[PDB]
Design a protein around this ligand. Structure first.
Ligand SMILES: Nc1nc2c(ncn2[C@@H]2O[C@H](COP(=O)(O)OP(=O)(O)OP(=O)(O)O)[C@@H](O)[C@H]2O)c(=O)[nH]1
Ligand SMILES: [Mg+2]
Lengths: 415, 198, 142, 570, 180, 10, 18
C-alpha cells in the first residue's frame, strides 16, 4: 500500500515519480537520500526506509533506487511484487536500465505508470498487454486483460509453430573450508520460448518421481523436485489434482516450471586450493581442480575464481590446463578454461611477492567460486516425456528444448 | 609511466563509486608492479598517482618503501616526491620515518637550498619524539646562520622541536640571542615566534 | 598554529588536505568527514567560525571549493581569515585564474606552495612577493 | 520561456500544443514549478489526441492541490470525457476524477462515478471501483451518501474476475478504514464464489482474493478443510506475494484446524517446500520472507524442524539477509544441528563485519545457553575466539563466558585459569565488568585473584558506576571467601568507595558492605556470598496474544518491523 | 621475437648485479661502502637510517645499500631485503662482546625464506689491530660452515688499509655471475 | 559546471 | 549449433501410459 512510487538516481535526483494515493507528500523523497547515507555509514541501511510515520521502501536498481513511499501498514510483499513487475516491464520496453532511457521515454513512461496501478492497487502487469495498449511510438484496452486468459493473447498467427525450450540447471555447492559441502542444492529451470499460431494449451509431461509413483512407474530415473513453481499460465488445479501440467503457453519466452531440490551427489568439479603464503615474503597458490562430471560432458567457459591477496603484486602462474589471468579490479585470479572435459585434472601453482609493510586491517577470506557451464548434461536425470500441444484449429507442432547445466552458487570456503 | 594528470582524468571519467574503486585498485596494482621491479625512471608519475589515490581515500601501505627510496635519491623531482610522500603518508605512529632520520641528516648538510628547505619543512611537519632527539643539534646549527630564506625555516624547526620536546628548549636559549635586528620580515617573525614559544 | 588545513569542494570532494597533527588514518578520515558534514550543513550567515573539538574551525570558501582551518583557541579569529586570503591570493598569482579543474591537476604545485608558505601550522612567509619568487626559483630547478 | 510556452499553448496548432505539453511535462519532471501555467492549459484541455489528453489530465492532477480554484474549470471536461466511447478514455477520466484531491471536485463527480459503476467493460468496472474507493478514502461520508457500498459488494459476485478482485480490494480498503460497523463479511457461498474465481484471477487479483479470506474466521472443520484444500494450489504460484498471502491464509486457518485431522499434517508437509522456495527469493524479498518465517516460527516451530541448511547465510548475502539468517538459525537451533550451528558460527566469526561478528557471537552464546548439551562446545568456541587475538572477538568471548558462568557455572571452573590470563588489558566496560564478576564469583580456582584485582583497583573511583560496583562486589566476595590475602584489599576498597566515591548508589553499596563487614564477617558469607537461585533467562518468544494477531497480519509492514499494526501507523 | 638487441648489449657488458650492506653497527660497513664507492676513509656519524650507493667494477654496477646494526635499524633491514640480490656482512673481529650479537643477527637474517638465493658474503672487519681474528676463526665462531645451501666466503678487509676488498668483490662477482 | 570559475575572480 | 546443449525434439505425451 505504497502512497507513491518514484524512480530515483545515483546522485539522489528523482528520474520520475507518480503519486497513487496522495497521502504522502512528494517532499519526503528528499529526506530519503540523507537517511540512506546515514544508514550506509552506520550499517543500518535497509531497502525499506522509514521517514517518521511514512515508510519509503526502496529497491536498488541498475542506476537509480526505486523508492516506493508508503504511509499505512501496506502489504510489503505486494509492494515488492509490484516493483518487480514494474522493473520487468521497463526491461522489456527499454533494453537499457540507466538514466539514458529514463529521460528519453517520459511521455510513454507516464502513461505506463498511470495504467499500471491506480490508488496503490496494481491493475496491469502483462508486458505484452501493456505494449498492446501503451506504446512509445491509443486504441481501446485489449480484451485479453478483461478475459480470463491474460497470459495467452488470442488471434496470434505464425507461419510455423516452433517452441524453443531451455532445461537450465543451476549447480550450487557450498563447500566449507574443512572440505565438506554444506549447501548442495540444484534448482531446475524449465523455460520455453513458444512461438506458434493461436493460443495452444501446453500439456507438460516429464519423468517426475511423483507422477511415476502415481502412475505405478516409480522404478526408473524420476526427478524428485523438492520445490516446483508453476508459471502464471500453468493451472494449479490440475497439478494439485493429478499433477497435470495443463496451461496456455505464453507468446514468447516464459518460465513454465522451476524445479528446486537438494543435491546429494558429488560436485561436478572438485577444486583443491593450497595457500603457501609466506610472512610478507611470497604467496603460493596450489590450486588443483578435478572434474567429477562425466567424461562425455565438457564444461564450456569454466572460470574458477581464486581470490588472490589484496596487496599482492608481481604474481607468477604455473598451471597446466587453462589460462590464468589476474584482474586488479577483482583482486583475484580466475582460472579461465575454454573447454573442460569431464574427468580433467588441472593443476596450478601461483607465486607472487608481497609488500614489506603489513596491512593495517584485515580483508577477509572471500569464498572461491567457479563459473563452469557444461551444456547437454542432465545431472538430475529428469527426462521430459511429452508436451501436449493442442489447438482448436489443429496444427502439427515441432517443439524443441535443450538441457543446459551451469554453476550457480558453487562457492568453496577458503582455508 | 602513467602521469598524475592522466590518472586524474580517468578518475573524473568514472561515475560509479564501485567503478572508481576498481579503477583505483587497478592503478594501485600497476604502481605496485612498477615499484616491485625497482623502477626509478617513471617513479615521479607513480608517486603522484599514489599520492592522489591516498588523498582520494585509497590505501598506500605498500607505497611506503618507494617514498623512502626516492627520498635518498639525487633527482630534484624525485627528492620532492619523496618529501611529499614522507609528509603525507609518514607520521610518528606510522613507524616508517625512523629510517628517514639518516636521510634527513644527510640532506641537512646538502648544499642545495631547495633540498635543505624541503627537508626542514618535512621535519617540522612530521616531527617525532625520537627524530627531534637525533636532529636537535642540526636544527640549532642552522639557527645561527645568516640566510634570511633559511632563518625562518630554522626558527620553525626549533619551534617544532621545542613543542615536541619541551626539554630541548634549553639548547635554544643562546641561539636566538641578539636577533631582534633582522631586516627581513620573515626572519623577524620567526624570531618573535620562537621567543614567544620559549 | 593550524592543526589541519583542507580544501574541500561544495559537493564534498576534497581538493586539498594538510594536517599538522599526527592522527590515525581512520581517525583522520572520520575527522575530515565530520568537518565536511559540518561545513556542508552550515548556512551562509554562520560567521564562518565553528568551535568544533575545542578548535577554531574557520570555514571561508570564495568559490565552489571551500577551505577549512583548525587552530587552537590562543589567537584572534581574523588572523586565520587574513592568512587564508593571503594564501588564496598567492596561489592565484602563482597559477593565474585558478579554477577547480586546475587545482586537481596542480595538486603537487598547490602542496608545494602551501609547504613553502606555512610549515607546522605556523606562518613562514609573511611577504607575498618573496614567497612567489622562492617558489618560482624552486620550480625552475627541475 | 514561460511567455513563449504560454503563447504556444494559446495557439490553434496541434503540433505546437503537443510540443508545449511535452516541454511542460519535461520541466515538471525536471523540477520546474509549472503550476502557474495550469490555467493557461485549462483552455487547451478538450483535445481529440489521446496523448495530449493524458498529459493535460496529469498536469491537472499535479496542479489540482496547488490551484484548487483553477480546477473548477475541468468538471465539464471530465463529465464530457466520462462518456467517451473508447474504454481507455473512460478509464483515464475515471482515474483522473478520483486522483483529483479537490473537496468540491468529487462532489460533482458522484454522478459520473454512479454512471461508470455499472460499466460493462471489465477495465471500466475496475476503474469505477478504484474511483469509488478513492472517493471513500477522501470522503467516507460522500461515499456512504452516494451508496457505493452496495455496488462494490455486488461487483464481487459478477464477471470480469479481475474487476471482481479490484472491487473486493476496494471494499476491503473501505472496510479497513471503516470503524468495523456494517462490515462486508460474506457467508460461505461468497467464500466459495471467491475461491472459484481465484483460479481465474490475475496475479494482482489473486492477492486481493486472498486478502478477503484473511479476515473471515472459519467455524467448521469441513469449511476449514475446504479452504485449506483450495489454498494449497496457491503455494505453487510463481508470485512471491501470492505465495506469502496463501501461507498467511493457511496459518490463520490452522488456528481453528484440528491437529488430530490429517489436514494439518498435510498442510505442514506442503508448507516446508514453500518456505524453502521463499527463502531463495530476491534480496529485497529475502528480508520479508525471513520476517514471515520468524513470525510463523513461534506458531508452528515443528513445520521447519528439518530446514537448517537453507538458513545458512551466503557469502554474497546482504547484511540484512545475513542477520535474518542468523536470527532464523538462533530461533531454529536444535541439538540435532548443534554441530552445524557451531561450525557456521565459527565460519561466521571469520568475516570482516564487526556488527556481523557481534551478532554471530550473540547467537552462539544464546545457543550455548539454551542447549546445555553444547555447553562444552560453546566454551571451546569462546576459548578459540579469545585465542584468535581479536579485540571485538575477545570482548564477545568474555561476555559469553560471563553469561555462561551466571547460567551454568557448576562446570565452569575449568575456564577460570584460561580466562585468568586472557589479555585482560581491554578497557571495554561490558567485558571488564563480566571479567570482574567472573573473578569475584569464581574466586576459587584462581590463586592470584587478589593480584588480578589489584590492577583494576588503580582507577576504581573513576572507572564507572557499574564497573565500580562490580569491582566492589568482587572484592567483598574475595574477602568473604579468602580474607587472609584480601584483608587489606577489602579495607582499601571500602575506603575508596566510601570516602572517594561520590556516587549515590555506589556510596550506599559501599556503606552497606562496610556495615556488614564490621557487624558480622561470618554472616557476610551467608549474606553476601550466598547461593543465588537459577537465573531466569528472558524468553525471546512473543506473547500468545501478539502471535495470534501477527498471524492474521501477514505480509504487511508490521510483520517486517515486528510491531503491532496499530503501533506502527501514523 | 628477436634477441639481437640483448646480444649487442651483452657483447659490451650489460650485467649490473646487486649487493646489500648488513652487519653490526660501527663494524666498518659505512667505511667499507665509502671505500668501495669513493676510495677514501670518510668519517661518518652513526647510521640512523641507511646509506644507498652503487659500485661499478668489471663492467657490473653492484649497488650496495649500507644498513646499520643499531637496535632501531636492525628491524629495518627487512625493508632493504626486498628487491635485493646480494648481501654483504660486516663482522667485528675487535668487538668480542658484539661478536655474539652480530652472529645472532646474521643467523636471524639467514633464517628468512626471502633471503635464500643470496650467497654468504662476510667481510673480516676490524683488520687493523692484533686482536682481529683470522679468516678461519671468525668463520668458525659465526658457524658459516653450518649454513646449508649458502655460498659463504671468508674475506678479511681493513677499512684503514683497504686490502681485501678486491678479493671480496671478485668472490661476490664469481658467486653471482658465472660467465666467461 | 562552476569549477572553471576563478576562486577570487581577479 | 548452440552452446549449452543442442535443441532436441519433444514428444506430445507418455505413449506408454495409455
Ligand atoms: N680506525 C679504524 N676504525 C675502523 C676500522 N675498521 C672499522 N672501523 C670502525 O668502523 C666504523 C665506521 O663507521 P661508519 O663510517 O659510520 O659506518 P658503520 O661501520 O656502518 O658505522 P655506523 O654508521 O655507526 O653504523 C668506525 O667508527 C670505526 O670505529 C679500521 O680499520 N680502523
Ligand atoms: Mg653507517
Amino acid at each position: 500500500s505504497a502512497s507513491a512510487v518514484y524512480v530515483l538516481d545515483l546522485k539522489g535526483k528523482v528520474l520520475i515519480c507518480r503519486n497513487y494515493r496522495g497521502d504522502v507528500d512528494m517532499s519526503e523523497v528528499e529526506h530519503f537520500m540523507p537517511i540512506l547515507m546515514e544508514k550506509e555509514e552506520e550499517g543500518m541501511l535497509s531497502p525499506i526506509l522509514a521517514h517518521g510515520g511514512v515508510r519509503f521502501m526502496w529497491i536498488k536498481h541498475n542506476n537509480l533506487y526505486l523508492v516506493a513511499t508508503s504511509k499505512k501498514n501496506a502489504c510489503v510483499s505486494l509492494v515488492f511484487s509490484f516493483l518487480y513487475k514494474v522493473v520487468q516491464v521497463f526491461s522489456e520496453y527499454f533494453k537499457e536500465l540507466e538514466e539514458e532511457s529514463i529521460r528519453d521515454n517520459f511521455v510513454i513512461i507516464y502513461e505506463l505508470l498511470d495504467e499500471l496501478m491506480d490508488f496503490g492497487y496494481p491493475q496491469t502487469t502483462d508486458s505484452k498487454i501493456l505494449q498492446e495498449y501503451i506504446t512509445q511510438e491509443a486504441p481501446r484496452p485489449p480484451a485479453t486483460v478483461t478475459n480470463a486468459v491474460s497470459w495467452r493473447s488470442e488471434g496470434i498467427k505464425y507461419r510455423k509453430n516452433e517452441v524453443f525450450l531451455d532445461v537450465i540447471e543451476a549447480v550450487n555447492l557450498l563447500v566449507s573450508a574443512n572440505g565438506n559441502v554444506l549447501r548442495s542444492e540444484i534448482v531446475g529451470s524449465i523455460k520455453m520460448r513458444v512461438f506458434l499460431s493461436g493460443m495452444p494449451e501446453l500439456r507438460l509431461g516429464l519423468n517426475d518421481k511423483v507422477l511415476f509413483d502415481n502412475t505405478g512407474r516409480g522404478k526408473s530415473k524420476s526427478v524428485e523436485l523438492e520445490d516446483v513453481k508453476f508459471h502464471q499460465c500453468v493451472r494449479l488445479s490440475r497439478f494439485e489434482n493429478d499433477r497435470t501440467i495443463s496451461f496456455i503457453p505464453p507468446d514468447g519466452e516464459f518460465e513454465l516450471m522451476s524445479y528446486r531440490l537438494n543435491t546429494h551427489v558429488k560436485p561436478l568439479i572438485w577444486i583443491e586450493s593450497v595457500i603457501e603464503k609466506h610472512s610478507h615474503s611470497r604467496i603460493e597458490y596450489m590450486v588443483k581442480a578435478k572434474s567429477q562430471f562425466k567424461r562425455r560432458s565438457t564444461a564450456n567457459n569454466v572460470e574458477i575464481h581464486i581470490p588472490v591477496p589484496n596487496d599482492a603484486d608481481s604474481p607468477k602462474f604455473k598451471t597446466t590446463v587453462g589460462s590464468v589471468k589476474w584482474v586488479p579490479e577483482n583482486s583475484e585470479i580466475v582460472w579461465s578454461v575454454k573447454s573442460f572435459p569431464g574427468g580433467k585434472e588441472y593443476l596450478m601453482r601461483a607465486h607472487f611477492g608481497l609488500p614489506s609493510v603489513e596491512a593495517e586491517d584485515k580483508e577477509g577470506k572471500p569464498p572461491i567460486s567457479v563459473k563452469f557451464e557444461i551444456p547437454y548434461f542432465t545431472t538430475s536425470g529428469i527426462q521430459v516425456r511429452y508436451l501436449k500441444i493442442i489447438e482448436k484449429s489443429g496444427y502439427q507442432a515441432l517443439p524443441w528444448v535443450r538441457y543446459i547445466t551451469q554453476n550457480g552458487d558453487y562457492q568453496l570456503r577458503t582455508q | 609511466p602513467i602521469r598524475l594528470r592522466e590518472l586524474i582524468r580517468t578518475i573524473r571519467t568514472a561515475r560509479t563509486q564501485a567503478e572508481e574503486r576498481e579503477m583505483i585498485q587497478k592503478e594501485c596494482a600497476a604502481i605496485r608492479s612498477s615499484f616491485r621491479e625497482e623502477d626509478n625512471t617513471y617513479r615521479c608519475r607513480n608517486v603522484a598517482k599514489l599520492l592522489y589515490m591516498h588523498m582520494l581515500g585509497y590505501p598506500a601501505h605498500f607505497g611506503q618503501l618507494e617514498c623512502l627510496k626516492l627520498i635518498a635519491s639525487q633527482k630534484f623531482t624525485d627528492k620532492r616526491i619523496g618529501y611529499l610522500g614522507a609528509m603525507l603518508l609518514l607520521d610518528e605512529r606510522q613507524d616508517v620515518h625512523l629510517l628517514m632520520t639518516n636521510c634527513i641528516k644527510n640532506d641537512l648538510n646538502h648544499s642545495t637550498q631547495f633540498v635543505q628547505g624541503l627537508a626542514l619543512c618535512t621535519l617540522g611537519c612530521m616531527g617525532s619524539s625520537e627524530m627531534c632527539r637525533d636532529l636537535a643539534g642540526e636544527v640549532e646549527k642552522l639557527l645561527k646562520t645568516s640566510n634570511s630564506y633559511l632563518r625562518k625555516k630554522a626558527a620553525l624547526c626549533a619551534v617544532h622541536v621545542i613543542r615536541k620536546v619541551p626539554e630541548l628548549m634549553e639548547m635554544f636559549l643562546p641561539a636566538t640571542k641578539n636577533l631582534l635586528n633582522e631586516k627581513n620580515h620573515g626572519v623577524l617573525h620567526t624570531s618573535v615566534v620562537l621567543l614567544t614559544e620559549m | 598554529m593550524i592543526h589541519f588545513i583542507l580544501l574541500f569542494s561544495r559537493q564534498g570532494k576534497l581538493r586539498l588536505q594538510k594536517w599538522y597533527i599526527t592522527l590515525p588514518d581512520k581517525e583522520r578520515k572520520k575527522i575530515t568527514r565530520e568537518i565536511v558534514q559540518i561545513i556542508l550543513s552550515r548556512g551562509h550567515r554562520t560567521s564562518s567560525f565553528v568551535d568544533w573539538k575545542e578548535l577554531k574551525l574557520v570555514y571561508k570558501r570564495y568559490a565552489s571549493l571551500y577551505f577549512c582551518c583548525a587552530i587552537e583557541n590562543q589567537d584572534n579569529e581574523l588572523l586565520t581569515l587574513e592568512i587564508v586570503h593571503r594564501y588564496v591570493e598567492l596561489l592565484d598569482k602563482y597559477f593565474g585564474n585558478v579554477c577547480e579543474l586546475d587545482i586537481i591537476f596542480n595538486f603537487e604545485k598547490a602542496y608545494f606552495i602551501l609547504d613553502e608558505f606555512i610549515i607546522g601550522g605556523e606562518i613562514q612567509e609573511t611577504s607575498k612577493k618573496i614567497a612567489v619568487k622562492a617558489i618560482e626559483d624552486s620550480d625552475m630547478l627541475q | 520561456e514561460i511567455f513563449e510556452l504560454k503563447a504556444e499553448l494559446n495557439s490553434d496548432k496541434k503540433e505546437k500544443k503537443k510540443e508545449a505539453v511535452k516541454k511542460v511535462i519535461a520541466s515538471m519532471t525536471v523540477g520546474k514549478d509549472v503550476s502557474a501555467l495550469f490555467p493557461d492549459v485549462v483552455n487547451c484541455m478538450q483535445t481529440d489526441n489521446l496523448e495530449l489528453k493524458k498529459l493535460v489530465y496529469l498536469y491537472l492532477m499535479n496542479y489540482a492541490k496547488s490551484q484548487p480554484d483553477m480546477a473548477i474549470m475541468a468538471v465539464n471536461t471530465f463529465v464530457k470525457d466520462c462518456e467517451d466511447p473508447n474504454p481507455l478514455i473512460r478509464a483515464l477520466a475515471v482515474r483522473t476524477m478520483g486522483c483529483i484531491r479537490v473537496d468540491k471536485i468529487t462532489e460533482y463527480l458522484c454522478e459520473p462515478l454512479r454512471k461508470c459503476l455499472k460499466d460493462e467493460d471489465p477495465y471500466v468496472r475496475k476503474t469505477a471501483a478504484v474511483c469509488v474507493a478513492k472517493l471513500h478514502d477522501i470522503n467516507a461520508q460522500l461515499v456512504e451518501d452516494q451508496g457505493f457500498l452496495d455496488t462494490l459488494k455486488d461487483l464481487i459476485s459478477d464477471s470480469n474476475p479481475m474487476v471482481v478482485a479490484n472491487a473486493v480490494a476496494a471494499l476491503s480498503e473501505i472496510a479497513e478504514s471503516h470503524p468495523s460497523s456494517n462490515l462486508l463479511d460474506l457467508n460461505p457461498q461468497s467464500i466459495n464464489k471467491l475461491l472459484t474465481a481465484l483460479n481465474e484471477c490475475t496475479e494482482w487479483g489473486q492477492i486481493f482474493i486472498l486478502d478477503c479470506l484473511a479476515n473471515y474466521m472459519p467455524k467448521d472443520d469441513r469449511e476449514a478443510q475446504s479452504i485449506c484444500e483450495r489454498v494449497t494450489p496457491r503455494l505453487s504460484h510463481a508470485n512471491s506475494a501470492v505465495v506469502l498471502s496463501a501461507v498467511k491464509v493457511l496459518m490463520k486457518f490452522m488456528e481453528m484446524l484440528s491437529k488430530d485431522l490429517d489436514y494439518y499434517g498435510t498442510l505442514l508437509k506442503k508448507l516446508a517446500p514453500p518456505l524453502v522456495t521463499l527463502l531463495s527469493a530476491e534480496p529485497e524479498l529475502q528480508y520479508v520472507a525471513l520476517r514471515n518465517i520468524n513470525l510463523i516460527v513461534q506458531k508452528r516451530p515443528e513445520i521447519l524442524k528439518h530446514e537448517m541448511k537453507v538458513f545458512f547465510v551466503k557469502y554474497n548475502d546482504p547484511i540484512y539477509v545475513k542477520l535474518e539468517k542468523l536470527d532464523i538459525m538462533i530461533r531454529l537451533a536444535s541439538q540435532a544441528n548443534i554441530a552445524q550451528v557451531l561450525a557456521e558460527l565459527r565460519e561466521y566469526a571469520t568475516e570482516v563485519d564487526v556488527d556481523f561478528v557481534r551478532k554471530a557471537v550473540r547467537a552462539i552464546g544464546r545457543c550455548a545457553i539454551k542447549v546445555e548439551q553444547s555447553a562444552e562446545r560453546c566454551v571451546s568456541t569462546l576459548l578459540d575466539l579469545i585465542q584468535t587475538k581479536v579485540n571485538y572477538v575477545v570482548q564477545e568471548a568474555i561476555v559469553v563466558i560471563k553469561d555462561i558462568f551466571r547460567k551454568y557455572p557448576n562446570k565452569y571452573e575449568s575456564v577460570i585459569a584460561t580466562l585468568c590470563e586472557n589479555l585482560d588489558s581491554l578497557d571495554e566496560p561490558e567485558a571488564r565488568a563480566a571479567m570482574i564478576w567472573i573473578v569475584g564469583e569464581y574466586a576459587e580456582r584462581i590463586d592470584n585473584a587478589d593480584e588480578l584485582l589489584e590492577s583494576f583497583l588503580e582507577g576504581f573511583h573513576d572507572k564507572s558506576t557499574q564497573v565500580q560496583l562490580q569491582l566492589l562486589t568482587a572484592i567483598v566476595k574475595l574477602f568473604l571467601k579468602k580474607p587472609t590475602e584480601t584483608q587489606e584489599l577489602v579495607q582499601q576498597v571500602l575506603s575508596l568507595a566510601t570516602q572517594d566515591s561520590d556516587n549515590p548508589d555506589l556510596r550506599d553499596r559501599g556503606y552497606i558492605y562496610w556495615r556488614l563487614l564490621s557487624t558480622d564477617p561470618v554472616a557476610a558469607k551467608e549474606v553476601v556470598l550466598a547461593e543465588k537461585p537459577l537465573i531466569s533467562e528472558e524468553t525471546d518468544l512473543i506473547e500468545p496474544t501478539l502471535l495470534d494477531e501477527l498471524i492474521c497480519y501477514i505480509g504487511t509492514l508490521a510483520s517486517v518491523y515486528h510491531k503491532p499494526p496499530s503501533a506502527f501507523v501514523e | 621475437g628477436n634477441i639481437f638487441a640483448n646480444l649487442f648489449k651483452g657483447l659490451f657488458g650489460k650485467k649490473e648485479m646487486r649487493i646489500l650492506m648488513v652487519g653490526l653497527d660501527a663494524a666498518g660497513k659505512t667505511t667499507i661502502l665509502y671505500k668501495l664507492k669513493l676510495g677514501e676513509i670518510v668519517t661518518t656519524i652513526p647510521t640512523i637510517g641507511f646509506n644507498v650507493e652503487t659500485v661499478e667494477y668489471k663492467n657490473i654496477s653492484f649497488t650496495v645499500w649500507d644498513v646499520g646494526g643499531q637496535d632501531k635499524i636492525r628491524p629495518l633491514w627487512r625493508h632493504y631485503f626486498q628487491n635485493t640480490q646480494g648481501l654483504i656482512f660486516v663482522v667485528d673481529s675487535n668487538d668480542r662482546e658484539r661478536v655474539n650479537e652480530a652472529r645472532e643477527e646474521l643467523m636471524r637474517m639467514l633464517a628468512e625464506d626471502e633471503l635464500r638465493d643470496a650467497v654468504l658474503l662476510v667481510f673480516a672487519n676490524k683488520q687493523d689491530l692484533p686482536n682481529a681474528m683470522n679468516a678461519a676463526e671468525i668463520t668458525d665462531k659465526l658457524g658459516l660452515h653450518s649454513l646449508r645451501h649458502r655460498n659463504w666466503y671468508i674475506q678479511a678487509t681493513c677499512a684503514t688499509s683497504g686490502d681485501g676488498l678486491y678479493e671480496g668483490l671478485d668472490w661476490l662477482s664469481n658467486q653471482l655471475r658465472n660467465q666467461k | 559546471k562552476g569549477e572553471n570559475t576563478s576562486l577570487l575572480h581577479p | 549449433d548452440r552452446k549449452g546443449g543442442s535443441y532436441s525434439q519433444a514428444a506430445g505425451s507418455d505413449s506408454a501410459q495409455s
